[PDB]
Design an enzyme around this catalytic site. Structure first.
Site, PDB file in Angstrom:
ATOM      1  N   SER C 122       0.773  -1.241   0.000  1.00  0.00           N
ATOM      2  CA  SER C 122       0.000   0.000   0.000  1.00  0.00           C
ATOM      3  C   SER C 122       0.807   1.297   0.000  1.00  0.00           C
ATOM      4  O   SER C 122       0.900   1.951  -1.039  1.00  0.00           O
ATOM      5  CB  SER C 122      -0.935   0.003   1.206  1.00  0.00           C
ATOM      6  OG  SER C 122      -0.206  -0.114   2.406  1.00  0.00           O
ATOM      7  N   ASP C 186     -11.472  -2.836  -0.471  1.00  0.00           N
ATOM      8  CA  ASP C 186     -10.241  -2.355   0.143  1.00  0.00           C
ATOM      9  C   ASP C 186     -10.350  -0.869   0.428  1.00  0.00           C
ATOM     10  O   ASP C 186     -10.811  -0.091  -0.407  1.00  0.00           O
ATOM     11  CB  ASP C 186      -9.049  -2.631  -0.761  1.00  0.00           C
ATOM     12  CG  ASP C 186      -7.739  -2.414  -0.072  1.00  0.00           C
ATOM     13  OD1 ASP C 186      -7.704  -1.696   0.940  1.00  0.00           O
ATOM     14  OD2 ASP C 186      -6.730  -2.962  -0.546  1.00  0.00           O
ATOM     15  N   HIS C 316      -8.014  -5.532   2.486  1.00  0.00           N
ATOM     16  CA  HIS C 316      -6.694  -4.967   2.210  1.00  0.00           C
ATOM     17  C   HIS C 316      -5.583  -6.008   2.174  1.00  0.00           C
ATOM     18  O   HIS C 316      -4.515  -5.716   1.631  1.00  0.00           O
ATOM     19  CB  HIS C 316      -6.299  -3.909   3.239  1.00  0.00           C
ATOM     20  CG  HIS C 316      -5.134  -3.062   2.815  1.00  0.00           C
ATOM     21  ND1 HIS C 316      -5.014  -2.543   1.546  1.00  0.00           N
ATOM     22  CD2 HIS C 316      -4.039  -2.645   3.492  1.00  0.00           C
ATOM     23  CE1 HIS C 316      -3.898  -1.843   1.461  1.00  0.00           C
ATOM     24  NE2 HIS C 316      -3.288  -1.888   2.629  1.00  0.00           N
TER      25      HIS C 316
END
Lengths: 509, 406, 580
Positions: C122, C186, C316
């Site tokens: 991320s 997500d 996620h």
């Protein structure tokens, strides 16, 4: 379907931003048969609340008419030549007029708050709503999209004005300042009173924003608002949706909007046609100077006795279209600005200044050949004075320099009312030569008029602000000079020495 | 040069001698004269004029963007040098004045020439007078003339009486060169002529109502340019128009500034084929009696900026072919039965992008519209409703040609 | 299909995910070689100073890029630079510096003719994108070859740039190198659409829950639901604002509201690949991606309102199942394919959301048709006759009078000048209409980089600008609004100048030569020494490039010659041009 999507999304956006809850909470606080108000200068924005007595059913349809020259009229800034009058709902007008007393100071407070770039909101329930609108419409007597303007939020109110009013406020900036929250179940009697501004309609499962007054007429023609705000809040997280207004209304709104956008693009396109028209006027003016007349006197003579083919085309095609176009431009931009930093951004403003200084003299020729007097204070049209004012406002913010050794041949005279002064002076001189049995106080005031004109002429010549074509042999200025030289005698001055020695033949060389 | 020209162009060039020096002549004047003198077609005569301009023997200038349609040449200047006119004169003094064919005569302050007491044998006579002329007319005989031109400079004018002696006249032209319009009088004498077929006036002050009073039984065409009409009367119903004017077909009114109302009598010429009111900027509307012209073919209204609408009785014009409204800026909407005309084929509507087409225009077939592109936006939506539409677009080229008429 | 679209295949996804997993351990980045491939993966972060910089005072953490280190990240004709997140830029600038031995490694990998790939989970993803752009500004833009094409492959990254960032990638044709994977629920691809004030008190806990390293932390129903709720509320307002001004529909009350509203400046860039358990959907359109970022994570039905807040967090961490099992899902490119109803309801979008996404795609099509109309107009024959009459008729006849077409126009004694003036006005109108379409964003991102347009606009500017200056000075317009270069010059000429200078480089303009000589003459030589020197210094370069013609300006009747001759013989003896 751009309009349908926009309406739903804008209603959704205003609901999510959160002004209805705050404003309605303040209203509920002031409530839970006279006119009262409250003020809250929170950190976010200053908020003004009006409360007012309940609704009179018998007095629902009475109205008071107002006029520009009327002196009890509080809003003289918004009546015009095409709308010299308008009428307002009576009870709310009386409440506002009575309250004027201390809200004068409140007006100072609110305008000063706005100038420092903070938001101001004026809101009220049903009848207090209408009064609030009046107060907002009272603050809006000065507008430029550089500076802020208040916002009015109005919960379930009756209409206040008639069709003349909504014609005044039809597609202007003063609409964007009003927001009327009305359930779809309320019905309105719009035979006499009319809606202005933008509306939020609160259905059961959603809400819609509509800015068109025709659609408000089609939807509302013929409650308790805590519940409807709760219903909107709950409907926010709906899992299914319909269309709340019918598709006939959608088609109407789309059609009118597309027409409006096209008409906006149209003048941007037509400005170049106007510039080619002005080029034709340039060559006409050049020939009028080659034959030693000047284009003002040639235009005037051929207006009295039409003989030529070029001149009829000048007058009837080029000048007529130019006048029409520029009247349209000024009529349109003084309700809806451009660029949010200045109305008439830069191509329109400078082209309009050139147009005024080239084309008004011929309007003066028409005015004075037709048999009229006192052009400057009683005769010139609105679009000319607006163009002069708007250009002069900016001309102080630009840096420029005028050389004292130039060729002034192609200069346009800055005062576009020069020939009006010359015509007035000629009138006075002939009235002196022709009158009989005239008193001496009037003879003295007429001599005052001549001396005033002499001062004006010498101060534009010495400042290099007139074009040499006023010295052409068959000009009207030279006729004035000859007749004034006769009625003067031997009283020598600056202007007489300039003219007599023949030093006017080297001006602007 | 003159000899090197073919036979026909010899006399076509010789006709130029009758017009005053440096005179800006519109191309329709000499074309009408030539049509009556030589019986040829207008188109081929315009071809002869183009030919004479190709051999650099005259100058031809268009004044605008009008095309060479059927005999509408009111929009082209012929302009000739001094020496070319002098050469055209040179070939025609060989024979004697009383027996000349082409004779140009001058009269200065009533000093009439002393050989006019004789019998003149010209067939093309021109007369020029100056500012001081007092209309004290000498009495002559001129029986061989077929054309006639009168150049004026006077504030007031009377037609000669011996006009009634020219039993062979065919054409008539009066041009005023003064600052202010001339007041014509003594005009009824023409009623004795059995062969007059075309008359043209220019810059002269005429009470237009005279023509029905005058019994012009053989007149084919009448054209007025820059004329003044004075006080517009109407109340003379004593004379049958359709019987006095049995042979009138074309009326061309151009640049008549003071004509605010069209006269009553022209609605009674049922032999009308063409009607042309161009550049008339005080005309706001047309009479509803125009629908009484059941055989009208052409109708031009070019460059009349104040005309707000077309009369309803345009339905009744069953013969209309050509319909020209170019540069009509004040025109707002066509009549709502315009689609009942089952012969209308063409239209020119340049700069008429502000004119709202009514529905029934879809009831037409095989029409050709000429227009600018901003006009086509009105004409592009309705295309799939019209089985044989053409919309031809030209562009306005810009020039200073009209600065010659300053 | 996927490979023909994006330029990458399955094993590259596999290797990138594995490397970005490895990067959880090493410090700041991690290099990996496989034959002709070298991939640099970047390390993520899960604190608060690495999303919103504590030093930054603004409400979204944004800073404006620098015109010397990213010269291409701007609007060319206008001048505006792009805006990025300050934390991510700081991280990249820490990585790039020489102490790290990062530049030397990439130079090693580039002189060997291998493929270069940047990637990361991320927060690392947000750094990967920045690195790609850095590479594109240093290496690919100087000799663009298929050897040097990079790749960026990110896994659930947050948003990085504004609208000018996306526009600048689009104009350069660089938007095809970037690929971003977003699962449906997500939550991190949606964080930076919120106000800093709305999450500052609940941000660190939910961040602590996202860390796959320090997994020992435990949930909280209410903190999770509050973070999710506020994040989606700010997302809602950003998307609605975007719809309402799609075409400038009744902007008036919207501006009146705008005095009350604060909305995030971050927009998607590159290609976005949404994934479900059945399908992969790819989008290149940024407006549609912005709408789907809100409508995909709304509730399919009602009772799912309690599952979404936690399933966002759990999704996620679902990019390993995605990468190992992507060949078994159906692939569809949304922009092209026209049966979007089945696709978009498969993603879970409602009917309102579907209409909004359709609106975005339609507006892209409208921009393309606008460009078609403009090309049709400028290809015609009347336009080019207008441009060729000045070249071949006016200019030679004015050269044969021995004064040039500038002075010929400025005297204006013939109908040829009237014709030049009317032609000048007509061309002015056409280029002004094109400029107006550019200013409203009615044209595609790559119009300013088209080469036919640059050639046309350069020819037009160099022919006709001298005539606009002659018009300005002919009629004393410079005593009503000042000197030309300040308030007189039209915007079309500035736009053309900027576009040409950008195209080549990757008394400031030569077409404005005449303006300078009009300002400089009639003045005593002491005050104008410096400016006359700079002008006569740049004249040689201008005459070579073709900005200024040499047959015109040295003519006997010309204005410049008659000013140059009156200068002192002391100056006229040492001038760079005294042999003219």
């Amino acid at each position: 379907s751009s309009s349908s999507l926009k309406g739903s999304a804008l209603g959704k956006l205003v609901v999510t931003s959160g002004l209805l809850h705050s404003s309605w909470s303040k209203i509920l606080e002031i409530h839970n048969s006279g006119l009262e108000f409250q003020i809250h200068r929170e950190e976010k924005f200053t908020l003004v609340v009006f409360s007012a007595p309940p609704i009179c059913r018998s007095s629902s349809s009475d109205s008071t008419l107002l006029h520009v020259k009327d002196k009890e009229n509080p809003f003289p800034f918004l009546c015009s030549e095409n709308n010299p009058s308008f009428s307002l709902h009576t009870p709310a007008f009386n409440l506002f007029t009575s309250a004027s007393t201390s809200l004068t100071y409140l007006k100072s407070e609110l305008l000063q708050t706005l100038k420092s770039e903070k938001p101001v909101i004026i809101t009220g329930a049903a009848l207090g709503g209408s009064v609030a609108s009046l107060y907002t419409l009272w603050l809006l007597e000065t507008i430029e999209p550089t500076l802020k303007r208040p916002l009015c939020i109005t919960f379930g109110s009756p209409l206040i004005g008639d069709a003349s009013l909504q014609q005044i406020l039809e597609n202007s900036v003063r609409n964007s300042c009003f927001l009327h929250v009305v359930s779809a179940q309320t019905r309105i009697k719009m035979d006499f009173f009319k809606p202005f501004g933008t509306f939020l309609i609160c259905f059961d499962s959603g809400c819609v924003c509509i800015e068109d007054h025709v659609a408000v007429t089609e939807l509302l023609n013929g409650v308790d608002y805590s519940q409807v705000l709760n219903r909107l809040d709950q409907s926010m997280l709906s899992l299914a949706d319909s269309r709340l207004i019918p598709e006939d209304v959608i088609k109407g709104i789309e059609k009118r909007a597309e027409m409006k956008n096209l008409r906006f693009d149209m003048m941007f396109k037509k400005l170049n046609d106007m510039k080619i028209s002005m080029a034709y006027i340039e060559w006409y003016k050049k020939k009028c100077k080659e034959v030693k007349i000047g284009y003002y006197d040639r235009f005037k003579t051929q207006l009295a006795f039409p003989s030529k083919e070029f001149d009829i085309n000048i007058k009837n095609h080029h000048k007529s279209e130019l006048n029409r176009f520029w009247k349209s431009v000024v009529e349109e931009v003084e309700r809806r600005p451009q660029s949010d930093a200045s109305i008439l951004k830069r191509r329109f403003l400078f082209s309009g200044n050139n147009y005024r200084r080239m084309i008004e003299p011929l309007d003066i020729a028409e005015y004075y050949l037709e048999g009229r007097k006192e052009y400057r204070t009683t005769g010139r049209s609105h679009h000319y004075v607006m163009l002069e004012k708007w250009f002069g406002m900016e001309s102080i913010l630009i840096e420029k320099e005028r050389c004292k050794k130039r060729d002034l041949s192609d200069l346009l005279t800055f005062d576009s009312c020069f020939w009006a002064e010359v015509e007035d002076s000629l009138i006075v001189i002939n009235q002196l030569n022709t009158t009989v049995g005239m008193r001496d106080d009037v003879r003295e005031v007429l001599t005052r008029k001549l001396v005033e004109f002499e001062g004006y002429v010498w101060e534009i010549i010495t400042k290099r602000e007139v074009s040499p074509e006023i010295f052409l042999e068959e000009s009207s200025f030279m006729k004035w000079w000859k007749e004034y030289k006769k009625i003067k005698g031997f009283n020598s001055s600056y202007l007489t020495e300039f003219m007599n020695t023949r030093k006017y033949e080297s001006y602007g060389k | 040069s003159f000899d090197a020209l073919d036979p026909n162009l010899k006399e076509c060039f010789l006709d130029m001698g009758s017009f005053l020096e440096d005179q800006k002549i519109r191309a329709s004047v000499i074309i009408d004269m030539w049509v009556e003198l030589y019986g040829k077609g207008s188109s081929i005569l315009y071809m002869y004029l183009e030919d004479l301009a190709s051999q650099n023997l005259l100058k031809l200038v268009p004044l605008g963007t009008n095309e060479h349609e059927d005999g509408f040449y009111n929009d082209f200047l012929v302009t000739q040098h001094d020496i070319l006119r002098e050469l055209a004169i040179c070939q025609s003094e060989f024979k004697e004045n009383l027996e000349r064919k082409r004779l140009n005569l001058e009269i200065l302050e009533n000093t009439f020439p002393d050989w006019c007491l004789n019998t003149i044998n010209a067939s093309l006579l021109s007369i020029s007078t100056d500012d001081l002329f007092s209309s004290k007319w000498l009495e002559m005989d001129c029986p061989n003339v077929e054309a006639l031109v009168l150049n004026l400079s006077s504030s007031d004018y009377a037609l000669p009486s011996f006009i009634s002696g020219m039993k062979k006249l065919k054409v008539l032209t009066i041009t005023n060169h003064g600052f202010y319009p001339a007041r014509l009088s003594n005009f009824s004498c023409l009623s004795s002529l059995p062969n007059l077929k075309r008359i043209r006036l220019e810059k002269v002050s005429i009470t237009l109502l005279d023509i029905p009073q005058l019994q012009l039984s053989s007149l084919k065409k009448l054209s007025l340019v820059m004329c003044s009409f004075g006080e517009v009367f109407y109340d003379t119903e004593d004379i049958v128009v359709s019987n006095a004017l049995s042979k009138l077909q074309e009326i061309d009114i151009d640049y008549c500034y003071d004509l605010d109302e069209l006269p009553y009598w022209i609605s009674e010429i049922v032999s009308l084929k063409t009607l042309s009111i161009t550049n008339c900027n005080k005309l706001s509307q047309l009479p509803e009696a125009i629908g009484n012209l059941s055989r009208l073919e052409v109708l031009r209204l070019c460059s009349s900026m104040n005309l707000s609408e077309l009369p309803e009785a345009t339905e009744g014009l069953s013969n209309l072919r050509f319909l020209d409204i170019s540069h009509c800026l004040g025109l707002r909407k066509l009549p709502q039965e315009i689609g009942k005309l089952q012969n209308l084929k063409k239209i020119s509507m340049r700069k008429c992008s502000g004119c709202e087409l009514p529905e029934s225009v879809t009831n037409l077939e095989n029409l050709e519209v000429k227009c600018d592109e901003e006009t086509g936006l009105l004409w592009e939506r309705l295309k799939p409703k019209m089985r044989n539409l053409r919309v031809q677009e030209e562009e306005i080229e810009h020039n200073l040609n009209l600065l010659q008429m300053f | 299909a996927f490979e023909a679209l994006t330029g990458i295949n399955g094993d590259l996804i596999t290797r990138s995910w594995s490397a970005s997993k490895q990067a959880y351990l090493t410090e700041r980045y991690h290099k990996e070689e496989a034959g002709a491939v070298v991939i640099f993966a970047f390390q993520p972060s899960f604190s608060e100073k690495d999303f919103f910089d504590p030093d930054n005072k603004s409400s979204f953490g944004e800073i404006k890029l620098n015109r010397v280190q990213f010269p291409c990240m701007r609007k060319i004709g206008k001048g505006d630079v792009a805006t990025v997140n300050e934390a991510f830029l700081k991280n990249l600038e820490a990585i790039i510096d020489p102490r790290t031995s990062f530049q030397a490694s990439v130079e090693m990998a580039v002189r060997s003719r291998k493929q270069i790939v940047f990637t990361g989970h991320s927060s690392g993803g947000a750094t990967a994108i920045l690195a790609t752009v850095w590479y594109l500004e240093k290496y690919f833009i100087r000799n663009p070859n298929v050897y040097l094409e990079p790749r960026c492959v990110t896994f659930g990254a947050p948003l990085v740039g504004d609208s000018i960032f996306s526009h600048a990638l689009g104009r350069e044709k660089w938007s095809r190198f970037f690929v971003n994977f977003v699962s449906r629920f997500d939550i991190v691809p949606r964080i930076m659409l919120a106000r800093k004030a709305s999450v500052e008190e609940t941000l660190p806990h939910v961040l602590a829950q996202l860390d796959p390293r320090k997994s020992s932390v435990q949930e909280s129903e209410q903190r999770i639901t509050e973070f999710y709720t506020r994040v989606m509320r700010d997302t809602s307002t950003v998307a609605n604002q975007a719809v309402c001004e799609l075409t400038g529909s009744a902007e008036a009350f919207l501006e009146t509201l705008s005095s009350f509203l604060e909305l995030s400046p971050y927009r998607p860039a590159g290609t976005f690949v949404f994934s479900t358990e059945k399908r992969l959907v790819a989008v290149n359109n940024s407006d549609a991606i912005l709408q789907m970022l809100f409508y995909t994570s709304q509730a399919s039905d009602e009772q799912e309102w309690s599952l979404i807040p936690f399933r966002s967090i759990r999704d996620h961490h679902s990019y390993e199942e995605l990468v190992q099992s992507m060949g078994k899902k159906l692939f569809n490119h949304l922009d092209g394919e026209n049966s979007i109803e089945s696709t978009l309801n498969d993603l879970g979008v409602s009917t309102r959301g579907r209409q909004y996404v359709q609106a975005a795609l339609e507006e892209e099509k409208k921009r393309v048709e606008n460009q078609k109309k403009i090309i049709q107009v400028i290809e015609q024959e009347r336009f080019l006759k207008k441009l060729a009459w000045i070249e071949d008729e006016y200019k030679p006849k004015c050269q044969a009078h021995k004064n040039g077409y500038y002075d010929s126009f400025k005297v204006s004694n013939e109908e040829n000048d009237f014709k030049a003036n009317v032609k000048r006005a007509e061309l002015a109108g056409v280029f002004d209409e094109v400029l107006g379409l550019m200013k409203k964003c009615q044209l595609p991102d790559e119009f300013e980089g088209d080469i036919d347009w640059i050639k046309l606009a350069t020819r037009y500017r160099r022919l006709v600008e001298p005539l606009d200056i002659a018009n300005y000075h002919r009629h004393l317009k410079n005593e009503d609004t000042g000197p030309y270069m300040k308030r007189g010059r039209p915007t079309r000429y500035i736009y053309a100048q900027r576009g040409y200078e950008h195209y080549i480089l990757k008394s400031e303009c030569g077409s404005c030569f005449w303006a300078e000589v009009e300002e400089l003459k009639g003045k005593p030589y002491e005050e104008v020494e410096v400016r006359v020197k700079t002008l006569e210094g740049m004249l040689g370069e201008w005459i070579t490039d073709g900005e200024v013609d040499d047959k015109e300006i040295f003519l006997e009747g010309s204005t410049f010659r008659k000013w140059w001759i009156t200068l002192p013989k002391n100056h006229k003896s040492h001038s760079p041009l005294r042999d003219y």
